[PDB]
Design a protein around this ligand. Structure first.
Ligand code: HEM
Ligand code: HEM
Ligand code: HEM
Ligand code: HEM
Lengths: 141, 146, 141, 146
């Protein structure tokens, strides 16, 4: 669990994003597949072409997931356990990759929330997405 | 360390508009603020207990541009970062003992700082072009380790 | 929250080590300090000499800690939260280092538990030390 | 040199007594067993759900010796790890899509396999001598991802 401050800052940031959450999510993904091509291998069927509805539609699935994460920041292990088993077991996603998306999410938020993305926020967010990635890999333990 | 013809343009064109006095310290400040354990190496800088105290710190800005200068010294030696950061490696590796991982950490912070500033002009591809350069500098600066 | 199997295996291997616990712990450290020097920055005074009582007596503190972890291997957050703050805050130990010691602990256990150290076990342990690392760094979240 | 005069001795001496057919496949086996996500790349090998099925797997032992062959090929040329694994690095990068972190991961498994076998003759210093070689091969094997 993050500091009461970190939470406020996250839900605050999540607040601004709001409707764009779905959008941003997909950008973060496209950003990932581009800067670190090895992550595309986890999405065979998906034709990851810019504008790719599969990636946009999925950039929506992660966004919602993260939102659900914020709802239960006080208890992420349970809220996400579902995604854990999937990503860890079923999918077998290399843990380094969870760090890669996170950084890509941040770059996404910075490029769309100019004066919103302060050092404090950047820290509450990187700290939030860390907990998130900590949880999604919990099943390798 | 590999930037296609159009990858190189985006990079060196973006780097053109970079406030060589700003970015520098904002990345080192955000590094100090986001990954706190890094403060251990900059204790002679003063009180870094508050983001504000960190960002505004005179030293963090002074050495911040010093670093941004080494990154520029990289986009001017893209082919041989191997040696460009050689001594800079012994300093960080043999003297300061900074774990190599953080070199990559700082790199991404720089990329956030950039994404921060140029907003949209910092498209996924250009970000990807930069991810490569930081990817190298970090490696080249860790040379005295591996 | 590692499989009941992983627990059995850990407690089993920890049983083997038993008395050597302290010894091995100290070997882990000396190994670490030699393989990755950077880890010496956190030890100016103890300034480690091969056979240093500082370490031999400290290789004992970590072993005791890890044992306590095995005891409460389904409440590591609470059992260790103590160490979290110390290593996370006061000391400010680079998380990358929590990984470096674990690898050194395994190498230690491999060189001393020949036919005991199976792949299954090597997994149950790397999986265990992983949970420990996670907890010690929980204070950066 | 890359390794000191005495570091080399420990290394090239320890490498002398390696069951050049064993270590290889035991390291790659354990890599697949301990860090499961690595299996994603070797599904054409068969069922890898049980440690036993992984270790005994004939493919894991065949390619296991092939890899241990590249590590020997690095110990032979501890000088140009970068070019000695050039194409081998593109294969892993441009075709196999393996994240470089894992090269480091596999290197430590190899070290585990050694400490496992040579019991005590694998002293902290000797370990440290190897930690360097792996550190290098891993880097060399990742150069083309920049
Ligand atoms: C904050 C991090 C992440 C979150 C929040 C997250 C969330 C999601 C969600 C919500 C789904 C849909 C799951 C369902 O069907 O119930 C999904 C699927 C999946 N995720 Fe993630 N994920 C994350 C990181 C990653 C990473 C690191 C990779 C890739 C390198 C990855 C690969 C996948 C794959 C391949 C699927 C299946 C998609 C499909 O084929 O439909 N995820 N993820
Ligand atoms: C991308 C890689 C990095 C670059 C470009 C870089 C560059 C530099 C440069 C140009 C200097 C100034 C040379 C001098 O006057 O001594 C320096 C010094 C130093 N760097 Fe870095 N550095 C990197 C990453 C880091 C990281 C990750 C840390 C640790 C969090 C760090 C810690 C230091 C320290 C403590 C000094 C000494 C500063 C002083 O007191 O003058 N650097 N670095
Ligand atoms: C493998 C998990 C680890 C455990 C269970 C652990 C446990 C401990 C314990 C119980 C103490 C002594 C507390 C006391 O003085 O009462 C300690 C102190 C310390 N540890 Fe760790 N530790 C671990 C990993 C690390 C790592 C990876 C580093 C990084 C190099 C580190 C650096 C230190 C330092 C600097 C001290 C202070 C020594 C002193 O002045 O007494 N520890 N540790
Ligand atoms: C850095 C140490 C490593 C060395 C020196 C090494 C060496 C080799 C060599 C020489 C080959 C080509 C010939 C053959 O297929 O047997 C190969 C193939 C391969 N390697 Fe690696 N490798 C390393 C690490 C890894 C890692 C970390 C992964 C796993 C995620 C990996 C995945 C692959 C795959 C997919 C193949 C194809 C095997 C087949 O299907 O026949 N390698 N490796």
């Amino acid at each position: 669990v993050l500091s009461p401050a970190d939470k406020t800052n996250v839900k605050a940031a999540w607040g601004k994003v709001g409707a764009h959450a779905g959008e941003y999510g997909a950008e973060a993904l496209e950003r990932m597949f581009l800067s670190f091509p090895t992550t595309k291998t986890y999405f065979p069927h998906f034709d990851l072409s810019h504008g790719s509805a599969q990636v946009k539609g999925h950039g929506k699935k992660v966004a919602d997931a993260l939102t659900n994460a914020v709802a239960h920041v006080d208890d992420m292990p349970n809220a996400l356990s579902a995604l854990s088993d999937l990503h860890a077991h079923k999918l077998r996603v290399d843990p380094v990759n969870f760090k890669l998306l996170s950084h890509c999410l941040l770059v996404t938020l910075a490029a769309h929330l100019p004066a919103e993305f302060t050092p404090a926020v950047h820290a509450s967010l990187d700290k939030f997405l860390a907990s998130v990635s900590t949880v999604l890999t919990s099943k390798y333990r | 360390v590999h930037l296609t013809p159009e990858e190189k343009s985006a990079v060196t064109a973006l780097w053109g508009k970079v406030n060589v006095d700003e970015v520098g310290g904002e990345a080192l400040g955000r590094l100090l603020v986001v990954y706190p354990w890094t403060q251990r190496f900059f204790e002679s800088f003063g009180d870094l207990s508050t983001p504000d105290a960190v960002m505004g710190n005179p030293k963090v800005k002074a050495h911040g541009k010093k670093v941004l200068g080494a990154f520029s010294d990289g986009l001017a030696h893209l082919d041989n970062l191997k040696g460009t950061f050689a001594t800079l490696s012994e300093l960080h590796c043999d003297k300061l003992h900074v774990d190599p991982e953080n070199f990559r950490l700082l790199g991404n912070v720089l990329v956030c700082v950039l994404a921060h500033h140029f907003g949209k002009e910092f498209t996924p591809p250009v970000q990807a072009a930069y991810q490569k350069v930081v990817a190298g500098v970090a490696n080249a600066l860790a040379h005295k380790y591996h």
